[PDB]
Symmetry: D2
Subunit: 483 residues, 4 copies
Amino acid sequence: MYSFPNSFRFGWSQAGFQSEMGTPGSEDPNTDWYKWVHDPENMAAGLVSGDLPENGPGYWGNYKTFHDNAQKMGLKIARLNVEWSRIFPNPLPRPFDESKQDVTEVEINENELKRLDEYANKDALNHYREIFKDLKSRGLYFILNMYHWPLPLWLHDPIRVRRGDFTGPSGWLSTRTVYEFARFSAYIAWKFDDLVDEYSTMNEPNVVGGLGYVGVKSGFPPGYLSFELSRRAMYNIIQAHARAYDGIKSVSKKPVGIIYANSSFQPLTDKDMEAVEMAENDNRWWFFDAIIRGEITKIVRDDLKGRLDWIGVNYYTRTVVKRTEKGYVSLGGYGHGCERNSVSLAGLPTSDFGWEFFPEGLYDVLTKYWNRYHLYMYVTENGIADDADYQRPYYLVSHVYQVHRAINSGADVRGYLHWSLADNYEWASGFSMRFGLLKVDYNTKRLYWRPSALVYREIATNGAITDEIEHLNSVPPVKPLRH
Amino acid sequence: MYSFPNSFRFGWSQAGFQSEMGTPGSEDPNTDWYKWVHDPENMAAGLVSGDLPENGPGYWGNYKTFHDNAQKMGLKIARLNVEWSRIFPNPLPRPFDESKQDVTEVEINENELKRLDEYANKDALNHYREIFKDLKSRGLYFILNMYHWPLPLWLHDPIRVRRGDFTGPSGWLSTRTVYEFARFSAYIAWKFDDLVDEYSTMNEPNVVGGLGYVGVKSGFPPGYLSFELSRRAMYNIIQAHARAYDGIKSVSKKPVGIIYANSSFQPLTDKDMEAVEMAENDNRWWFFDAIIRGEITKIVRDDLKGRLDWIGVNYYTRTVVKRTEKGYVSLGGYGHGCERNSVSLAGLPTSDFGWEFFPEGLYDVLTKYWNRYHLYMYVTENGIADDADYQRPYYLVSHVYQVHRAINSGADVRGYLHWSLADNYEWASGFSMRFGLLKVDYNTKRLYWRPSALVYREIATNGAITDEIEHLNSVPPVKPLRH
Amino acid sequence: MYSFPNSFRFGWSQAGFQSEMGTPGSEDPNTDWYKWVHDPENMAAGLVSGDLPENGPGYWGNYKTFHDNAQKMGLKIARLNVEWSRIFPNPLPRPFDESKQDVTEVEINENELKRLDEYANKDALNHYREIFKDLKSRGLYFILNMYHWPLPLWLHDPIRVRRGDFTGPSGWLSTRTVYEFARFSAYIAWKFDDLVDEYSTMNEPNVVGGLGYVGVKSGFPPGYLSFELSRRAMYNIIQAHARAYDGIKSVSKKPVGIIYANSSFQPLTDKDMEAVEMAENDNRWWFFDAIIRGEITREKIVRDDLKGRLDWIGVNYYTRTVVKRTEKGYVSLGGYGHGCERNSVSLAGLPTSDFGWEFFPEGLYDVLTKYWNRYHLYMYVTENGIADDADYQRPYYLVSHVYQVHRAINSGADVRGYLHWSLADNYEWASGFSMRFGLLKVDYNTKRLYWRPSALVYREIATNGAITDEIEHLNSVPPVKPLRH
Amino acid sequence: MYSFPNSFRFGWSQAGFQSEMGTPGSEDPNTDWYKWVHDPENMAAGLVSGDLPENGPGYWGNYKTFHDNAQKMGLKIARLNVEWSRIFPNPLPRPFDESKQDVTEVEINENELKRLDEYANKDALNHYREIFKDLKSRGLYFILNMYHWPLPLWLHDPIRVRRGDFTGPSGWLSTRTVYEFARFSAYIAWKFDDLVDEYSTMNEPNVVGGLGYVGVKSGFPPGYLSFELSRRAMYNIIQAHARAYDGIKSVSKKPVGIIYANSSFQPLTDKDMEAVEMAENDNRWWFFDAIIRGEITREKIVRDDLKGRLDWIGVNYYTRTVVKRTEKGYVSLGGYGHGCERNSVSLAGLPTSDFGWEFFPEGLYDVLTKYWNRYHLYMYVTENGIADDADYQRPYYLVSHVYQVHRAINSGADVRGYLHWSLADNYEWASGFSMRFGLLKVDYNTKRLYWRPSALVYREIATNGAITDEIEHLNSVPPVKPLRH
Ligand SMILES: *[C@H]1O[C@H](CO)[C@@H](O)[C@H](O)[C@H]1F
Ligand SMILES: *[C@H]1O[C@H](CO)[C@@H](O)[C@H](O)[C@H]1F
Ligand SMILES: *[C@H]1O[C@H](CO)[C@@H](O)[C@H](O)[C@H]1F
Ligand SMILES: *[C@H]1O[C@H](CO)[C@@H](O)[C@H](O)[C@H]1F
């Protein structure tokens, strides 16, 4: 067996936009993401699938059932977000010089929070309180995340921006968004601190900026292709994180972290070790050096330094890189760039999403973060698109084993949160990518236990990979699978 | 949910030759099957795999572990056999005219049984008693089968017969085998009746005669191709069953049945309904009409009539048939005649063994037996060769659902015994075909729970297909599988 | 045997941007498409493959070898374009009210043509003459097409437009492009009429507008997502075709047609026949009714300056599109036609190409006879072929489609040739070199050409003017069992 | 370009039982193989496919069409056999001590030959003359092989032997068969020497003995599993070859060889080179050392009646066999060579044929040079080809193997021809018609022959006496990505 520390918790992560809608009364039409996926031109271009989030798994109405299942599964931790748009669907009065590049301080106090209180949707706040109370009643430790991608439409009209019109609400391209995010975060902590155990400011800010402004074939808003604007967005989100951290801490003593998208960078040949380091710099360290050490572009900002208590490690697979004349390149046929339901260039099985099976990468990522920063971590996201459940038992056990490995090596990792408890709306891809331990019938909203959920119950209730399921710490046999 | 009657039991079936060997001290070299799979010429021809049963899962030594797992899985019934060869490894004195075609009576009494007692291996008998006592101690209802293919070498030297030499011990071609089988059966019932709940005389006698003397590419002993001898073998096994029934009943009041190999015969087109009936006659009814109604070739034998209390239904898949000028033919590309790890001509997924997914056939088979004979049934064998466990969750739930269907239609079915609890020696195919709910590491003899074992625990402990696993009542998705 | 009329020609089609570059001195850096495929942001987004056209098959320098192989193969017809950008790499003098929606006339006269001649690249012009003379010397009948997608950069900066900046040269969004295209076409006809047998104005205008402004994941320039601008571009392209027809006709008596991208619209169920007609309307008839009948929407009007501007129709065809009737109209279905997985099988169990396109030769018969019945204009099959580096499917694809043209003629359709796409592998736009459509395989390192077995099959057809008895079995679906699923 | 010597010939090989039947009046019901494939028990067991040879490609009646296509293809060599059973359908008079293990001499003289002539079927003899004359009239050099597996029923009742009854005619288990084969071969040479260029005694004797008496799942007659009888059959076949060589030589001066089944033995790891040599010994050298050097085991002796009975070696080749060193000796590995899944990929990632045979052309170079270096006898590649109905892989298979023969010659090996298996599809023994090895596809309903694209490729090779520059790319592995795994 592989036994975890007594304090270690197994659970799940989920997002508001992806899971909340589906029950009549739950509709939230007031985000950039909602408008984006309903857009006729985006649908015709195939940038979005045409599936709509209001036809989703219905966590807004059915949360007690989700929680019932999580409890039966032996889970002890959950991480979810509040949707900004639900709490503040209407524009807030303008506060602050918008032409200033840096946002070093956002003044938050009791009076300001009472003023914000008057714009807040009380029905939305009360409902979230009901969800979170029910969550805590099952003995679930609660990580509350402030942000998981959709912005209020009054802060970002993504179709205007897609069209090249920058005179409207411009999302992360505007310091107004940074200012309002800091206040939103302080406000939520103020309202919910009695229920929350730890905070995250944001989920995967690197994906928001990266796919929003460079990876435009992904169909992420606002889908405006610009290196310059991607950099500006990331610059803003970094300061938003730091200001949100300060805002939360002005109101709470609880740990405040961030959740980030990772790949394990791997060398094509033994000549490519430098390529790996350059990739890690460009994709990971530059960001964390900013919010931990205050280092940015090369200066040190005192308002950025030390704004992090913990690191949420999201992980699916590797990225294979090679050294190039001018720098380095990532290789197709490995990691996330494989054919769906097939095999990679290395002979490893790929998911419904085309992502290569590579659990060793998780050990790489956890130990690299640990060695650089010595901040404790949660694995906040890890799972596989697999409607049939063919690969998930192996994927689950293997990755959980790698976490045990990391801890054994000395890394402080305090939980593992699978993505996800149930199937949900996979962004531009729609519902077809199914990541749940529980299968959702979207017609009836009924939840079913895939056999991997039974396997996860074994792990969670025992606090260990037990002897009986240890064989699942292996690669899914490829011979019976599609090539 | 699909709830079963309160008296219905879920369990497993297994065979002595397939599961017993593997622990030092368990070796039984004294059968036709042992000699057959060790034969140099058979190995060179590829009639046998070259794997050997002494390297098996080790139930002889490790039975307590098997039983521990079965108990944890919530199982309430088991069917196993004693190996004739273990109890009587040495030739018995000749009794009886061997040239007589019919064996209508075998006189068994207390003195004769005490005489047999003096030739019996007491170590073998005591060990089986220890296994069966431990079995009963877990609350397992016990079906004891007398015969599951291997014969003592003193009754059959299969290599002599393969070579066309009929002067030696000739197995089912000899009425001496019939006579000794009746006595063996009476003797075992005499010794074990205190532990046994129900009896079976034999497992799949149709496969012994069919593959032994016609399907010679299967590598079953003695592999001598002859329509005439196949008929003679089946004739003898039928009378052996009837004489064993009488022998058991002379010593016990408990139910005595038989376990038989079935396919669901299915028409290629709507013009092939007569073909199905002819196939069912030729493969099923002729045999059961003999031992139930005494009808044979067309006379009635009073010594054959009524020798059956229950029917063990084994089932894996369908056989598709078409009407022909002269009669009917079975079609390749369906049922058991498909490519391994692929899809049939109908687009249905196939197993590691090349057998097509067709659970509807089980309902067909159970209701056809019920309507003809009105004898109660157990599903004594059903499962899938699937080392990866990709298809087994679906295969398990779907077939269990079909049993529920049969009962709902009025058929008296009293249990479902999966083939098998753990991986075992698959005859001429060796170890590569893995049918276990538990995976065996043959190097260490350790047992692991495949996720289907967790699913089966849900069914067995609840006496139902529960709401949460009901989605597994469906075909494994073929898109992610090999074609 | 399936024998074709004595006058019927078998040949090939090719494009300048896709095949010309690759030999020293052949580079043409002056198009929207060139800039588009070299753009760092496009490359990082994966909108373009990162392959570059200047590493291509080298027709500019190696045309004699291409033609040698085509002659050996028994081909008797070729359709090729001149690249606008090579002839006019620098801007021409502004002439004309740019705010006017319609362009009903573009006056061109001998003096105007002589002025244009002062701005033309003479090296480019003379090189094209050398290519075309050599082509004619092999006995190849010549269809000269004026346009096959790239515009001179001085008429379209696609990166600016991608970024949502409409102050620069805006390609088909501007009537200046329409005006200049008319002049360009008249000019090329004026210079080359002694070498040309028939003319096409454009290749697949519907793809330029459709992928440029709606199907933006395809990585076609300028990749600015707008229903309204797609319609504006198509409106301009339609008037550019008409103005180019008049321009050519001012200078030549030879037939002038257009080449257009087609799929065969097929009903999912027997309840979807109306869906097919609606898709045919929206994808095909609306365009050809404008340039043949002068019918258009601006309400529904007849423009006398558009009516009758077409002598022949170039039918391009790869596969079907399966459509189903919807509440609000119709939709096309994934898993059939060009929307399949690569090297696999469609939802109907038909094999797919390296490009993910379904094998459906029957669709060519559908398309040819439908055009014939509507307009009664003679046709050439101007593009038909398959992405297939291995040559597994191409022998079947070639024979089967050629058979369907024989079928169409047999039904009464006037079809005068079949031009395979293509003689040799070439640069497949945003996909780069990996999609190989050649009868001949190109080694891009040496520029050497190799005969795939399908090329031997094509030689049998072309030399005999028939699908001969010996290769008739190839009129069938490639066996799916040995192929990838 | 890879050019062959001016004297080198490209052609094909074919067998009587596999190709002759299919036309009215061509039936030959009088062999062990005929009885074997019609046997109800064999069919029910699946030992044979249920397909029947009398529904075959019809060479008996359609030989002129076969030859027309071969001439069109530029072929210049053919190897064919006479079926013993057609010439002597009824038993000959018993001559000779059957209990003697060795047959050191078989006296044949003109008077004996004239007596044999009284028993021969004259219609069969005259028909074969008509076939062979027509063959020679196309300019095809003729290798006549005497035996390609089926024996007259009066010499072998395989069902009786399958059943373990050795009292009847027992085929290669009897020295009577050896004696009669010698006479038969002398007789055929005596009758046909004016038409024949070179002779082979037998085709693949190692398969007759190996699959007949050990590899019994293959469904070859008599399918009686016995190491001891396999050795006895091989011993007899060896002396039958020697006696047939002397018999032919008594009547002709022309070269007399043998055709043998080969695989290239390859080491799994660098530690397995000894395993290869042991496999080469056991599968190849033991046989050829007997008939060339007279060395045999009965202990290890030299028989003067066996020594030197070979002028040339016919090299048959499909694929490799991978072997590994074992405690007790060596073993061959599944998942490589002929032990792969059909239409898939081997453990090494190499594509497999419709028969499950791995693509490994390098093995042909290995086999040819090894024979050359051991014996220094000239060779023909007498059999090489692939089961491939779709023709996906055959173009690569053909070009690549032909290249490896060019390689062997270049290294100094005397190789005088390459004969593809086969010109047309035919009856593949226990597998029936489903395994299609033809350059030409046969429609078994009409008996019509179609040229697969590989046949066009072969015509390029044969007419040029070279792999030409244009098809040189086919000297490569069929791309695996678009194929089934
Ligand atoms: C992490 O990845 C999963 C799978 O793509 C997404 O659904 C989550 O929103 C993202 F946070
Ligand atoms: C029923 O079938 C299974 C799978 O072939 C065998 O292992 C059993 O012995 C037979 F009874
Ligand atoms: C017709 O289609 C082919 C293949 O997509 C393109 O290469 C041509 O440029 C287009 F005209
Ligand atoms: C050589 O091999 C081929 C293919 O198995 C057979 O058809 C020939 O008869 C044999 F000589």
